[PDB]
Amino acid sequence: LNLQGINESTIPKVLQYYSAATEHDRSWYKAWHAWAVMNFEAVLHYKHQNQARDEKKKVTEDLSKTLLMYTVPAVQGFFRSISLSRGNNLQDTLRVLTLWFDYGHWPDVNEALVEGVKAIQIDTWLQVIPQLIARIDTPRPLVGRLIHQLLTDIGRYHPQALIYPLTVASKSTTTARHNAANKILKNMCEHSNTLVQQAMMVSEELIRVAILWHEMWHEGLEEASRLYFGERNVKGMFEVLEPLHAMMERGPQTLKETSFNQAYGRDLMEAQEWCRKYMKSGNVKDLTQAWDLYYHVFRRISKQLPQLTSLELQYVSPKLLMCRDLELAVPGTYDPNQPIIRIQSIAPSLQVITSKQRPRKLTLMGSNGHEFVFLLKGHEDLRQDERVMQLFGLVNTLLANDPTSLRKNLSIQRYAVIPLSTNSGLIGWVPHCDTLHALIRDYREKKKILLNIEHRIMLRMAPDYDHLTLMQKVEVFEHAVNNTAGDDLAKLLWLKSPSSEVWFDRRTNYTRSLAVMSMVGYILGLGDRHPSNLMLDRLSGKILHIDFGDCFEVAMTREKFPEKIPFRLTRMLTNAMEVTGLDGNYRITCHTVMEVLREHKDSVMAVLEAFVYDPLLNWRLMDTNTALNKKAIQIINRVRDKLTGRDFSHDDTLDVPTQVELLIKQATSHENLCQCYIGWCPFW
Amino acid sequence: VGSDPVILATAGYDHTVRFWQAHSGICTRTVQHQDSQVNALEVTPDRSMIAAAGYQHIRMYDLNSNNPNPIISYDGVNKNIASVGFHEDGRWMYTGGEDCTARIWDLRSRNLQCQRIFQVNAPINCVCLHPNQAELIVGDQSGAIHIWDLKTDHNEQLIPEPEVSITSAHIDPDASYMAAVNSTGNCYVWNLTGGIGDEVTQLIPKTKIPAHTRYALQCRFSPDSTLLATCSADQTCKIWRTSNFSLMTELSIKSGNPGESSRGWMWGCAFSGDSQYIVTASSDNLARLWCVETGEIKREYGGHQKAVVCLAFNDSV
Amino acid sequence: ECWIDPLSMGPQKALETIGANLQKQYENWQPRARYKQSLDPTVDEVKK
Amino acid sequence: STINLQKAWGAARRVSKDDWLEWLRRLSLELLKDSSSPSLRSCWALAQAYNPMARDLFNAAFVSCWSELNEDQQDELIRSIELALTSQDIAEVTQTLLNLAEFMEHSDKGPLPLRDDNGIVLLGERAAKCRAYAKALHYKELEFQKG
C-alpha cells in the first residue's frame, strides 16, 4: 500500500495478504483489524469512485453487489477485532456504526450486524451511546428496529448510562425522536421505573432553574425588539413572543413564578391583548401600547437581574429541596467498574455566577460523601463539548499507550459535560482553576499596573488602530510590545508558588500541557482562544480549555475579524516557559504529540468523521457555510491533510519536525497577530 | 501652495494634511481629514487638485484655493484604499484596496460608481501605472504581481517568491527596469522587454538585492532612472544606483545608541525635480529633506502630532 | 430585620423593602397617618 | 536592642557545625525578643525550650526586625549574612538562610540587597552545594535575564 497506493489492482492483492495473515494467526488482533479496515476502505473507495464517475441503472446494481462483497467481511472483521482488543475497540466500534447506519438497511449487512451484536459484549457499546441515540429516529426501519433492541439491553444492564441522554431525547421538539425515546423508556420502566421518574423530574427542575421566566422574557424581548425596531419583522416578532405567553399559560408552579405573574404577568397579559388586537386590526397605535408595556417590564427586569446574585431552592424549585437519597447517580460519574456514586442530596443554595449568560453553580452531595460541583449553563448547546470530550478521552488513551508520552506524563485535562436540552446542560466544575484574564487583572491591580496599558499605548500612538493598514498595524503592535515588559504571567507563577521546587514542577507541567493542547487544537481546528477561554490550575499547573464554540476553522471562515492564528502562542505564554524559549520543552513536546497522532491517524480520523457527519451537529457547518454533505467532506479532507503534514502544501509532504516549525512561525508571526480581534488580546 | 511651483504636502494619523514649503520649511495651510487616517497622497499631473486616499473614501483637495472642503469624495469602497494612481491625461484615476478588487474612476464623469474592475486573489497593496499609460501593475499580499492591460485586460500574473506580501513596486519613467519589494526585505528588479503594441511586457529577473534585514516598505526610481531608493522598517532609507545595484548612499534615522527601541519606521522616498535632493517621511513625526550625494539632512519638517505615512512632491512647471 | 433577610434581596432593594414593610406593620396600629421614610439619611435630610 | 545582635553578627569565630548552629539559635532567640509584634515576642520562652519553634518563626522574626532597622542595621546585618555564607558555610545554616532569601523574595519588601544584584551569584553557588537545584535554577535564570 505504501509503495503502490489504493486502486483497482492493489485491493485484491492486499486482501489476499491480510486474509493469509488472518489464517496463519487467528487470535492476532492486528491481523483482523488490518483486514477489517482494508475491506472498509475498499468500500469507501468504490463508493467515492461511483460518485466520481456515475454521478458526475446497472452500475448502482453492480455497486450493490460490489460493496456488499466487501461489507460483510468488514463487519465480521471489526466485530472480531473488538473482542480481541478488549478495551481499545473505540475505532472499530465506530466503524461498525458507520457501516451499520450507511448500509445496514440491506438484509445481508443487517444479518451480519445482528450476529455481531449478539457476539459482542454489551459493555463495548457504552462508549458510543451518544452516537446511537443520535440516530434514534433513523428513517430506515430495519436499522432503527435493531437500535431500539440494542438500547433495550443497554437499559437492562447499566441503565445509569442511558437515562440522561434518553431523558433529553424524550423532550425533543421533533416528534420522531421523542416518540422513539418514549417507546424505549416504556421498556426501561418495567425493569426499574424508579430511575425514569426520578431523572424526568430532576431534569425538568434543572431546566426550570437553568432558565427562569424573567430570563426567558428578557432574551425574548431583546430578540423581538431587534426584529421590530431593527428589521421590521412583525410576524417574526410574534413568533418569538407567543411561546413565552404559552409558557406562562401553564401557571405559577413555584413561588418565584407566582411573584413574577403577580408583578409582571398582569402587564404581559395586557400587552398580549394589544398584540391580539393588532392581529385582527393592524394599527400602529395598538402595537405601540404593547411595546410600552413590554419595555416597562423589560426595564424592570433589567433592573432586577443584577440583584439576582443567588437563588434559593425553597423558592425556585422546592421539588429539588425535597429530593433526598436519590438512586439516580451523579451525572458523568457512572462507571461499570466503580460503585455507583448516587446522589445523596442537593445543596439548598445556588451561587449564580455573574456573567453574560449567568450560569449557576450546582453542587451535589454524593453517597460516598464527597461534594460534586457543576456549572449549569443555559442557552448554550453542549453536544459539541460532549463530542469534543470524547475526542480528548481518545487522545489521552493514545498518549498513555505511547511509552515516550507516558514517561513525560502527557495528557489533556478534561471535565464532565452532561447536556440536559438543546439549550441548557450541566458542565462539571473544575476546581482550583481561574481564567488567565483574571490572573493578569489581579496581578496588575496588585502591582498598580494599568490593565489595558498595551491597548492604551496603541491608541495613544495611533488612535485609528482598527482602521490602519496591515503594515501600520504591525508597527503599532511592535511598538507596544517593545514598550511593555511581557513577563506578568512568569512573575506571578513564581510569586504564587510556595517554593522553588514546586514552582519548577508547575512550570514543567504547564509547558507540556500547553504544547499538547496547541497541537490537538490545531488538528481539531479550535479557534477563538482568548484569555477568558483558558484557565490555569493553581496546583497542578496544567492549562484547561473551555467553551469550544468555534471549531473546524470557523474563526478563519468568518468575514468579521478573521483569526489567522492556528493556536495561541503569545509572548506572555512563551515567557512563562523556560528562559531559552520555545526551542526547549515546547518544541520537543510538540514533536512527540504530532508523531503519535500521525501514527494513529486512522483512529483519530474515524472519530472525527462520525460526529461531523451527524445530522444533529450539521447545523454548525451549515451556519459556517455562506450542499451540507459537500461542506462536511471538505472539512474532513483538510483535517486529513493536517495529520499527513500536507496541509501547508498539497504537492509536497512535510515531515513532523518541518511541519511543527512552520506552525510555530505562523502562530508567532507579527503580521498574523495584528489582524486578530483586539478582544483576543494579542499583546498578552 | 498651488501658485508656488514646488508642492510638498504631508499627512498622517493626526487627521490633517499640511502643505509645507521646500525652500523655507513652514506650514502654509492645513486641511482636515476626519473619519480616518491618510494612506497615500498624490498630486495630479495637471496640479489642479491633490488626492488623499483614506478609509472607504478617496478624497481630493484643492491645490490652488486655500481652506476648501474636499472637492471629490469618492465613496462606495471598503477595507481602506492602499494607493491611488493618476492618468497623465487627467481623465482616469486608479486605486487599490484590501477588497481584492482594483478599480478605475473617471474624474470627468459625475458618476459615483467606478468604471472598470480587476478582481484578484489577495488584497492589493500597491498600484503603479506604466508610463506608456497602457499597463497597470498590481501587487498583492500573496506575492502575485499582475499587469492588467488597459486595452486587452490580459493580466500576466507573476510570483517572484511564494507566500511573501509584496508591499510596494515601482517602474522608472523610461520603462527600462521595474523594481518590486516584499516584507522579507528583498528588491526584485525586472528588465522590461521593449514591447508597446505587442504588449508582451516580459519581466526578466535581473537581481534580487538583499536590501534590508526587516520589512521593506517603499521603493521608487528617480526621474533620472539612475537611482533606486528603498525604505524599510530598519530606520534606514537606502539608495541603490540603477546601473550597478550598489548602495550609493544610506540615509538612516537611527539613534546611534543601543538603548532606543522603535524610534520609527521609514517609508518615504521622493526624489527632487533633478534628483539632487530627496524628501523622506518617518514615523518619528518628522519629514526630512535629505541630500542625495552627500547624505545630509538639509531641512527637517516638524509639527505633526502623530506619525507621518504619506508624502507629496511636485516640481512640475 | 422587619422579618426580611437583607442579604437575600441585595443591598439597595432590601433597604427599600424593609422601609415599605415597616410602614405596613405600623399601619396595622395607625393606618391613617402620613408616613415618610428616611433610609440612611443625611443631617439636612433629617432636618427637612 | 542591637548590642547582642552586633555581637552575633561580627563574631565569625566558629570552627565547627555546632558552633554555627549555636550562632543560629542565639540569632533566632535575639530576633524573637526584639520582635515588635508581641505574638512573636511571646513565643521566645518556648523557642528556648524547643528548637523547632524557633526555626518555624525564623522568617517572620527576620522580616519584623528587618523592617524596623533604619538601613544602617540592615547593612550591618547583610554584611554578616554575606560572611556566614561565603566563609565557614554549614549545610544546615545555609539552607536556613536560603529559605530566608526565598521568603524575602515573596515578600512585598523585596529581596535583601547583598553584594549587589541581590546576591544572584552567591546564593546560586550556595544552593548548588546544598544540592537545592530548583533554587539554583531559579537564581541562574534571573542572571540569564540580566545578560
From Swiss-Prot, chain A:
Known outcome of mutating residue 349 to A: Reduced activity of the mTORC1 complex
Cross-link (Glycyl lysine isopeptide (Lys-Gly) (interchain with G-Cter in ubiquitin)): 256
Residues in PI3K/PI4K catalytic domain copies: 346-626
Posttranslational modification: Autophosphorylates when part of mTORC1 or mTORC2. Phosphorylation in the kinase domain modulates the interactions of MTOR with RPTOR and AKT1S1/PRAS40 and leads to increased intrinsic mTORC1 kinase activity. Phosphorylation at Ser-349 by TBK1 in response to growth factors and pathogen recognition receptors promotes mTORC1 activity. Phosphorylation at Ser-349 by TBK1 in response to EGF growth factor promotes mTORC2 activity, leading to AKT1 phosphorylation and activation.
Repeat positions for TPR: 88-120, 121-160, 161-195
Amino acids binding ATP: 355, 357, 375, 377, 380, 415, 428-430, 435, 535, 546
Effect of substituting residue 349 to D: Mimics phosphorylation; leading to stronger phosphorylation of RPS6KB1. Increased activity of the mTORC1 complex
Positions bound to Mg(2+): 533, 547
Effect noted on mutating residue 256 to R: Complete loss ubiquitination by the SCF(FBXO22) complex
Location(s) in or outside the cell: Lysosome membrane; Endoplasmic reticulum membrane; Golgi apparatus membrane; Cell membrane
Residues carrying Phosphothreonine: 354, 363
Domain notes from UniProt: The kinase domain (PI3K/PI4K) is intrinsically active but has a highly restricted catalytic center. The FAT domain forms three discontinuous subdomains of alpha-helical TPR repeats plus a single subdomain of HEAT repeats. The four domains pack sequentially to form a C-shaped a-solenoid that clamps onto the kinase domain.
Protein name, as recorded: Serine/threonine-protein kinase mTOR
Source organism of this protein record: Homo sapiens (Human)
Curated annotation (Swiss-Prot), chain B:
CDD domains xrefs: WD40 (cd00200)
WD repeats: 1-30, 33-73, 76-115, 119-158, 161-200, 211-250, 261-302
InterPro entries assigned: G-protein_beta_WD-40_rep, MLST8, Quinoprotein_ADH-like_sf, WD40/YVTN_repeat-like_dom_sf, WD40_repeat_CS, WD40_rpt
PTM note: Phosphorylation at Thr-44 by CDK1 promotes ubiquitination by the SCF(FBXW7) complex, followed by degradation. Ubiquitination by the SCF(FBXW7) and SCF(FBXW11) complexes following phosphorylation at Thr-44 by CDK1, leads to its degradation by the proteasome. Ubiquitination at Lys-298 and Lys-306 by TRAF2 via 'Lys-63'-linked polyubiquitin chains inhibits formation of the mTORC2 complex, while promoting formation of the mTORC1 complex: ubiquitination disrupts the interaction between MLST8 and MAPKAP1/SIN1 to favor mTORC1 assembly. Deubiquitination at Lys-298 and Lys-306 by OTUD7B promotes MLST8 interaction with MAPKAP1/SIN1, facilitating mTORC2 assembly.
Result when mutating residue 48 to A: Does not affect ubiquitination by the SCF(FBXW7) complex
Keyword check for RNA-binding: no
Major subcellular location class: membrane
SUPFAM superfamilies per UniProt: Quinoprotein alcohol dehydrogenase-like (SSF50998)
Pfam families: WD40 (PF00400)
Keywords of this entry: Acetylation, Cytoplasm, Isopeptide bond, Lysosome, Membrane, Phosphoprotein, Repeat, Ubl conjugation, WD repeat
Tissue and organ expression note: Broadly expressed, with highest levels in skeletal muscle, heart and kidney.
Positions of modified residues (Phosphothreonine): 44
Places the protein is found: Lysosome membrane; Cytoplasm
Domain of life: Eukaryota
Ubl conjugation in keyword set: yes
Cross-link (Glycyl lysine isopeptide (Lys-Gly) (interchain with G-Cter in ubiquitin)): 298, 306
The family this protein is said to belong to: Belongs to the WD repeat LST8 family.
From Swiss-Prot, chain C:
Domain of life of the native organism: Eukaryota
Subcellular location as annotated: Lysosome membrane; Cytoplasm; Cytoplasmic granule
Tissues expressed in: Highly expressed in skeletal muscle, and in a lesser extent in brain, lung, small intestine, kidney and placenta.
Residue numbers carrying Phosphoserine: 38
Post-translational events: O-GlcNAcylated by OGT upon glucose sufficiency, promoting interaction with small GTPases Rag (RagA/RRAGA, RagB/RRAGB, RagC/RRAGC and/or RagD/RRAGD) and subsequent recruitment of mTORC1 to lysosomal membranes, leading to activation of the mTORC1 complex.
Described purpose of this protein according to its UniProt entry: Component of the mechanistic target of rapamycin complex 1 (mTORC1), an evolutionarily conserved central nutrient sensor that stimulates anabolic reactions and macromolecule biosynthesis to promote cellular biomass generation and growth. In response to nutrients, growth factors or amino acids, mTORC1 is recruited to the lysosome membrane and promotes protein, lipid and nucleotide synthesis by phosphorylating several substrates, such as ribosomal protein S6 kinase (RPS6KB1 and RPS6KB2) and EIF4EBP1 (4E-BP1).
Family: Belongs to the WD repeat RAPTOR family.
Name of the protein this chain belongs to: Regulatory-associated protein of mTOR
Native source organism of the sequence: Homo sapiens (Human)
Portion of the parent chain present: 85 to 132 of 1335
From Swiss-Prot, chain D:
Taxonomy, superkingdom: Eukaryota
Subcellular location, record wording: Lysosome membrane; Endoplasmic reticulum membrane; Golgi apparatus membrane; Cell membrane
Signal peptide: none
TPR repeats: 86-122, 123-147
UniProt modification remark: Autophosphorylates when part of mTORC1 or mTORC2. Phosphorylation in the kinase domain modulates the interactions of MTOR with RPTOR and AKT1S1/PRAS40 and leads to increased intrinsic mTORC1 kinase activity.
Coiled coil location: none
HEAT repeats by residue range: 14-51, 52-85
Tissues showing expression: Expressed in numerous tissues, with highest levels in testis.
Residues carrying Phosphoserine: 1
Record remark on domains: The kinase domain (PI3K/PI4K) is intrinsically active but has a highly restricted catalytic center.
Subunit structure, interactors included: Part of the mechanistic target of rapamycin complex 1 (mTORC1) which contains MTOR, MLST8 and RPTOR. The mTORC1 complex is a 1 Md obligate dimer of two stoichiometric heterotetramers with overall dimensions of 290 A x 210 A x 135 A. It has a rhomboid shape and a central cavity, the dimeric interfaces are formed by interlocking interactions between the two MTOR and the two RPTOR subunits.
Family: Belongs to the PI3/PI4-kinase family.
UniProt disease annotation: Smith-Kingsmore syndrome: An autosomal dominant syndrome characterized by intellectual disability, macrocephaly, seizures, umbilical hernia, and facial dysmorphic features.
Protein name, entry field: Serine/threonine-protein kinase mTOR
Organism: Homo sapiens
Gene label: MTOR
